[PDB]
C-alpha cells in the first residue's frame, strides 16, 4: 500500500495473507469471506507470463494478522488449504478481466476479536455504493512505494497497510490506461489534481476494497486488488476485480463445493 | 499541465548535482547496477529477521524512509528523462521515416542522465542512512538486554534448544501424518513448525534471548495448538525426530518405531497439561 | 457465518469507531 498508514488492531478482521511456503514468501492478500471460504485474485495462483502456478500443497492461509513479521500466537490462524478454484474465464493472457478465485481451507477457522468475514454485496449495494468520488479502503502488507528498479525490490512495511481511496468514473479508468478494461472491473484512486495520493501496490494484488454502507453500517468488500501500472502514479489508478460482477460464480463454487 | 517544478523533498541529492557533468553511457550502467545494489543491501538489512521486534519499529521506519527518499529521487529523475526521451524519439522518427525502431515503453526505459555528484550524494546518503540505524540499534539493544546480540556460543545452544524442540513436533507430526482422523491438524503442525523456523536452508537465527524465549513458546503453543484440536492429550516424553535414525525412507524401520511410540504415549497422557498451556483456549 | 458478516468484534460491536471511517462516510 502507497501512501497508506498502520492499521489499528482488528480493523481489518476479514483480513488473509497468502504465502508460499517454500522458498517462504508473502505471496498476496486475500480475504475471510465465511469460516471455510478466502476470495483472492486469480492472478496470484495462476499467471503463466510469469511461471506462476500455486497448486494447493505449495500454499498457506494466514489470518488473523497485524504484523508481518513475526508469527502471533494468540491472535494468528494458519489454515492449509483444501482447494483452490480459479475463475474458468479468467483472462490472464490479454488484461486480467475475471481476476479471481476461491480456496477452500481444509477446516473451518474460528472466529475471534481478530478473524472475521466481511460481506459480499447484493446488486443494490453494488449500484448504491459503486459511484465516483465515494471512498472505498484497501489493505495489505504490500510494497511501500514503486521503485526505480524492478530489481530494487520490495519494500514492505511490518503492521497491515490501510488507504481509502475513491472511485473514478468509468471514462477516465478508460482514458487513463492501454490496457482494455472490462465490466468486471472498476478503478479507484485520486485525480493529478485532487491532491491527495495512494494507492494498492505489488503484493496487495487479491486484497479487499471494502466499503461500509451507510444503512446497515456493516463492512462490504466491493473490489479485489487486481492491477495497475507503477503505483501511485499521477493520471494512473489502480484496478479492482468487481465482486458483484462475478457473484453469481462465487455462489455456484460454494454451493457445489464443500 | 503548466509543467510541475519540484523533486520530492526526503532525498539528500543537492538539487544543483543532476545539473553537472553526465557520465558515458557505457560507464553509466555500472553506476546504476552499484546504487542497485546498495538499495537491495540497505532493504536487506532493515528486513533482517531479529528486526521484526517492536522496539526496532522507529528506527526502521526512519531507514524506511530514507531509502525510498533516495528511490523516489532516481524514480523522478526517470520521470523526466523519460518524458525528454519520448519528444527525443519523435523528432528522431520525423528524420528517419523509414526507421521501423519503436519506441521503449517507461518499464524498457533505463536512466540515461546521471552526474557523479548525484552518484556520489547517493551513495553517501545511504551509507549515512544504514550507519545511523546501526547506531539506533545499538542503543535500542543497550536499553533492551533480551535483544543484545548472542555470542556464537549462546547463539548455537540456543538454537539447538528450538531445533530440539521443533523436532519434538516434528514426530507428533510424523505420528499423526498417516492418520485418517487427525492428518490435517498434523499437517498443519509441520506447516506451521516449518513456517516459524524459517526456510531449512537459511533459517530464522536464535540471535538474542528475546527470540529464544519467543520462539520456544511459539513452538510449544503450535505443538498445544495440535493437542488442543485433535482432542488429544501431550505427553510428557516425546523423542525427538532425527533423520539419521527415523528417516522415512532410509530408516524405516526407525522411523516406525518413533511413530508406535509417540502414538503410544499420546493414548497413555492424562489431561494435566491443558492447565499450563501456553495460550489461552477457550 | 456471513450473518454476522462485516462487524467488527472491536470496533462496530464495542460501538468504537476507527481513525478513518468517517472519512468514508463523509464520501457519500
Ligand atoms: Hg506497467
Ligand atoms: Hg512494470
Known sequence: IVEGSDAEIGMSPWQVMLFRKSPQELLCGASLISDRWVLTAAHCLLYPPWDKNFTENDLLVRIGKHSRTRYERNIEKISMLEKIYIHPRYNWRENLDRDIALMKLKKPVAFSDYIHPVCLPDRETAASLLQAGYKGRVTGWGNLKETWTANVGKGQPSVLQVVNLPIVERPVCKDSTRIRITDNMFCAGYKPDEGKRGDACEGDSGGPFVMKSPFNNRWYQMGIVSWGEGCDRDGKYGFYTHVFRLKKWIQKVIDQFG | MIVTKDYSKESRVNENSKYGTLISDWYLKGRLTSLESQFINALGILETYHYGEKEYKDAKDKLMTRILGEDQYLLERKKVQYEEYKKLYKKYKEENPTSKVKMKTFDQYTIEDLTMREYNELTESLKSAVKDFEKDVEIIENQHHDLKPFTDEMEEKATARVDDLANKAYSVYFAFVRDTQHKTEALELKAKVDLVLGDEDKPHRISNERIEKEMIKDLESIIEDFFIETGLNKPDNITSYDSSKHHYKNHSEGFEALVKETREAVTNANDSWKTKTVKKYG | ?28
Open chain 3, 1 to 28: 457465518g456471513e450473518a454476522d458478516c462485516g462487524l467488527r468484534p472491536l470496533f462496530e460491536k464495542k460501538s468504537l469507531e476507527d481513525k478513518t471511517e468517517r472519512e468514508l462516510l463523509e464520501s457519500y
